[PDB]
Amino acid sequence: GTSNRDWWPNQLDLSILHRHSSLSDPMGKDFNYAQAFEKLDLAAVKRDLHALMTTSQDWWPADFGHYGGLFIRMAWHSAGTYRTADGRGGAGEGQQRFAPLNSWPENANLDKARRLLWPIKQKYGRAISWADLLILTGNVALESMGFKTFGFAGGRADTWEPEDVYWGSEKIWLELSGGPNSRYSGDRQLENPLAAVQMGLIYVNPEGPDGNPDPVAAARDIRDTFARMAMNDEETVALIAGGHTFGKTHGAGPASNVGAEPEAAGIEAQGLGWKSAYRTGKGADAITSGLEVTWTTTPTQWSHNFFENLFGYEWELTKSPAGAHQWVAKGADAVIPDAFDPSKKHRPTMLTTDLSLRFDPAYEKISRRFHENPEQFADAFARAWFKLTHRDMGPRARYLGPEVPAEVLLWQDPIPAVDHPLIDAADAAELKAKVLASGLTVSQLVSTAWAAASTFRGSDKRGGANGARIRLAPQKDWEANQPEQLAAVLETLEAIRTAFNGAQRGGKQVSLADLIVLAGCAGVEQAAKNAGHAVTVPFAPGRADASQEQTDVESMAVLEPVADGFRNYLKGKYRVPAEVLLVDKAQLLTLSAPEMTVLLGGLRVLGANVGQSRHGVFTAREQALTNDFFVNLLDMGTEWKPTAADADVFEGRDRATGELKWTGTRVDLVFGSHSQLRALAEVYGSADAQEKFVRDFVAVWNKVMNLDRFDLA
């Protein structure tokens, strides 16, 4: 059945902006998951999960009579797809249950684990999401096996279709690096935004880099991938040794016995996959990864036996029954229990990637410290586990239920509690007029607010104007934010705020975060008035000002907008065309294509471009809010050609006279080229549309201003 993707494979795909519509959602339009969750008897869910842990089902018998290890792996894979570069992946949307993640090789037999949870999901229904349940099950597995977690927050609403994520360009599952779609270049440099070493892996290859069983080299990949998931060395060691305190791997026979992954299996498999022809295909005969390693003498109980074994033996390279490289303890007794036969025991074994924790010099120090101080190991693992499973959930205001930890952590980008009365409508109007009487222009006001609010990304719910982090390092020094200009605008706004705040009674004050946004709204109102329209831009107060000490400078780095088509900005030259990067940014901002289109057209004519570039500024009334961008873009009396100096800049000349009328980038002209975007541009570029343009612009502006306002949900 031949499609548009087949005919025109490099044409821009707008469908990623139109997912998660009300059409695909089986819940009412009014369904509020937070409110369903807040009535969940969470204690009763955990008791059921507790019982499930030791209630073996014959279709996937429990190793050692306890599902704990399997469910921990389940919950770590749900969290483990996360990338700090774009915030995509992680546990927060329950995506492990949809394609492609449900069928990745490294997710093999997690289909069994999810199926085991259906009876409990079915019992509690909409009051607990799959997304929350996966994580909660991992916590309960840990608890049942004697490990006290740091806490748990609910709130991850389920989604109903696959997320659109760039996982890599390889066409072969698990392809070794150096192929025609190599995710590596230079000195083993992993391309952004990826955070895994091969297509269909979580982080690294457990045999070692491209299957080469060198723990030292494996450690480099571990450190790189984990850094790309926002985890440092201490956290990494704690997670890997923590996880591999429990359970086992499965490689009881050759991998060629394993059939089709879930998305490729027959209909009769009812959503399960990796059906195995090896002996019983399950339990004692299970094959998952191809490795056959059991790390500890008590795989169903928390202990410090991972590090006792790691350091207490010397290790020899060997092969599993499926031919995978793995390691066995030299001269050891048979001390490790068998998963099904009480009369058999086995020698201690390890993965190459476990040995990384001893043979990398920086990890070795952390590992020794954790070996000598198992209470520090426990505490670090608890904290890292919470971070792992919550890193993509967003501000603490989204956190639900009775196990939310009270400690505020730096990676949460925390925002102080508001401790005073808020400005009211009359105050907002007074502040807007003061902003406009200061002499700040429409362009300055719009640009600064855009810069502050457009750091949000819906992928992990980080960023936005709350916190006023634009005044702090590193945001205040980002090139896209024009640091010298930004500093002068911030200083003027701070004087207005100090004057407003000094005049108040009863403790009422306004935050800089709120005033930045409100100043932007005044800019947009003034632009509308300059075009002859009377509109009020909505504004919701309640943002607070975060401190530098509450702002991790390194974790903020990934929010830098190295491409921002809405300001016609690109920091350098990329492999990816700028229009694709625009659509990527729009998706992170949660915008539809009509939203993206309105917002861009408006921003152009308001002067929001970085460096005051005239590219795409298709108006003779700059700083008035009109649909001139569209009217001019769609004017057939202009002919467009790439410049001689730069193929990515275009000159628009009068077709009759040859006179230069405009310049534009790829991001500008895509709205006149792409057949779906041009259809949208046409709507806003019609003679009846100026009022619609203004109203839709103001709505989308307000939307962007409020993206991080989970205090108002």
Of 199-258, binders to a copy of itself (CB under 8 A) are 199
Q: For residues 372 and 369, what is the distance between their CA atoms, to the nearest angstrom?
A: 5
Ranges within 20-49 binding a copy of itself (CB under 8 A): 21-27
- Give the contacts of 63 (CB within 8 A, at least 6 positions apart): 69, 70, 247, 248, 283, 286, 299, 339, 340
Q: How far is the CB of 6 from a copy of itself (least distance, A)?
A: 7
Choose among ligand HEM, a copy of itself, Na ion, none what residue 685 binds, the Cβ cut-off being 5 to 8 Å by kind. Answer: a copy of itself
Residues whose CB is less than 8 angstroms from the CB of residue 122 and which lie 6 or more positions away in sequence, other chains included: none
Q: Could you give the CA distance from residue 264 to residue 284 in angstroms, rounded to a whole number?
A: 25
Element (H, E) at 326: strand 325-329
Rounded least distance, CB 5 to a copy of itself, Å: 7
Q: Given candidates 122, 180, 331, 575, which one binds a copy of itself under the rule CB under 8 A?
A: 122
Largest CA-CA distance found in the chain, in angstroms, rounded: 94
Choose, by CB under 6 A, the member of 81, 95, 249, 367 that binds ligand HEM.
249
- Per partner kind, with CB cut-offs from 5 to 8 A, the member of ligand HEM, a copy of itself, Na ion, none near residue 90 is Na ion
x/- track of binding to Na ion for residues 89-108 (CB under 5 A): -x------------------
| Contact set for ligand HEM, span 200-219 (CB under 6 A) | 203-204, 206
Interface residues for a copy of itself in 301-360 (CB under 8 A)?
A: none
- Minimum distance, C-beta of residue 271 to a copy of itself, in the bound complex (Å): 5
CA distance 426 to 306: 64
**Partner in contact with 269, chosen from Na ion, a copy of itself, ligand HEM, none, beta carbon below 5 to 8 Å by kind:** a copy of itself
CA atoms of 589 and 454, how far apart (whole Å)? 7
The answer to whether 346 is annotated as binding is: no
Cα separation, 588 vs 568, whole angstroms: 17
Smaller CB separation from a copy of itself, 257 or 676: 676
Q: According to CB under 5 A, which one of 175, 413, 460, 584 is a site residue for Na ion?
A: 460
- Residue 72's binding partner out of a copy of itself, ligand HEM, Na ion, none, with CB under 5 to 8 Å set by partner kind: ligand HEM
How near is the Cβ of 80 to a copy of itself at its closest, in Å? 19
From candidates 271, 323, 416, 611, binder to a copy of itself by CB under 8 A: 271
CB 374 within 8 A of CB 382: no
Site for ligand HEM in 346-365 (CB under 6 A): 353
- Per the rule left: phi > 0, alpha: psi between -120 and 50, beta: everything else, 341 is beta
Which positions from 554 through 583 interact with a copy of itself, judged by CB under 8 A?
Answer: 579
In eight-state DSSP terms, residue 102 is G
Q: Which of 70, 194, 197, 310 lies at the binding interface for ligand HEM (CB under 6 A)?
A: 70
Give me the residues paired with residue 287 across strands: 251
User: How far apart are CB 527 and ligand HEM at their closest, in Å?
Assistant: 45
Q: Angle CA(301)–CA(306)–CA(308) in degrees, nearest 5?
A: 115
- Partner interacting with residue 209 (select from a copy of itself, ligand HEM, Na ion, none; CB below 5-8 Å by kind): none
Report, in Å, the least distance between residue 70 CB and ligand HEM: 4
Cβ at position 478, least distance to a copy of itself in Å: 27
Question: Any contact of residue 123 with a copy of itself (CB under 8 A)?
Answer: yes
Q: After which residues is the chain broken (C to N over 2.5 A)?
A: none
90: left (phi > 0), else alpha (psi -120 to 50), else beta? left
Amino acid at 170: E
The stretch near a copy of itself (CB under 8 A) out of 456-464, 543-551, 587-595, 604-612 is 587-595
Q: Any idea which residue has 């494996």 for tokens?
A: 218
What is the spatial distance between Cα 454 and Cα 567, in angstroms, rounded to a whole number?
11
Q: Rounded CA gap, 113 and 272, in Å?
A: 10
Task: Please say which residue, 150 or 478, places its beta carbon nearer to ligand HEM.
Answer: 150
User: Among residues 42, 60, 62, 73, which is the contact residue for ligand HEM, using CB under 6 A?
Assistant: 73
Based on the shown chain and the rule CB under 8 A, indicate whether residue 373 belongs to the binding site for a copy of itself. Answer: no
Window 49-88: residues binding a copy of itself (CB under 8 A)? 57-59
Rule CB under 5 A: say whether 235 interacts with Na ion.
no
Query: Which of 83-91, 122-130, 224-232, 494-502 is the region at the interface with a copy of itself (rule: CB under 8 A)?
Result: 122-130
Stretch near a copy of itself under the rule CB under 8 A, chosen from 44-52, 144-152, 366-374, 631-639: 631-639
Strands 349-350 and 325-329: antiparallel
What track of x and - describes contact with ligand HEM for positions 75 through 114 (by CB under 6 A)?
-x--------------------------------------
> Considering only residues 242, 395, 616, 672, which one is a binding residue for ligand HEM as defined by CB under 6 A?
242
CB of 480 to a copy of itself, least distance (A): 23
Binding a copy of itself by CB under 8 A: which of 34, 328, 409, 689? 689
d(CA 711, CA 631): 39
Instruction: Let me know the angle formed at the C-alpha of 147 by 229 and 384, rounded to the nearest 5 degrees.
Output: 15
- Within 381-420, the residues that bind a copy of itself by CB under 8 A are none
What token pair was written down for 18?
A: 């139109």
Select 168 or 542, whichever has its Cβ closest to a copy of itself: 168
Q: Closest approach of Cβ 635 to a copy of itself, in Å?
A: 9
Give the Cα separation of 585 and 272 in Å (integer).
35
Burial class (CB in 10 A: 0-12, 13-18, 19+), 484: exposed
Helix (H, G, I), strand (E, B) or coil at 564: strand
Contact of 531 with 621, CB cutoff 8 Å: yes
Contact between residue 587 and residue 563 where contact means Cβ atoms under 8 Å apart? no
User: Is the distance from CB of 40 to CB of 401 less than 8 angstroms?
Assistant: yes
Which residue, 244 or 432, has its beta carbon nearer to ligand HEM? 244
Q: Which of 56, 192, 530, 676 binds a copy of itself (CB under 8 A)?
A: 676
d(CA 671, CA 479): 26
CA distance 641 to 682: 21
The residues annotated with a catalytic role in the active site are 77
Q: Where are the alpha helices (DSSP H) in 504-592?
A: 512-530, 553-556, 578-588
User: What minimum distance in Å lies between the beta carbon of 299 and Na ion?
Assistant: 31
Interface with Na ion by CB under 5 A: which range of 392-400, 404-412, 631-639, 695-703? Answer: 392-400
Structure tokens at 261: 């992954």
- 3-state SS class at 248: strand
Q: Residue 171, interface with a copy of itself (CB under 8 A)?
A: yes
* Nearest residue to 610 (alpha-carbon basis) of 665, 650, 652: 665
Q: Site for Na ion (CB under 5 A): which residue of 249, 459, 482, 665?
A: 459
CB of 176 to a copy of itself, least distance (A): 16
Q: Which residues contact 516 (CB under 8 A, 6 or more apart)?
A: 448, 449, 452, 465, 468, 470, 490, 493
| Binding interface with ligand HEM (CB under 6 A) | 63, 69-70, 72-73, 76, 203-204, 206, 222, 239-240, 242-244, 246-250, 288-289, 291, 353
Binding-site residues for heme b sit at 244
Binding-site residues sit at 244
| Binding interface with Na ion (CB under 5 A) | 87-88, 90, 392, 459-460
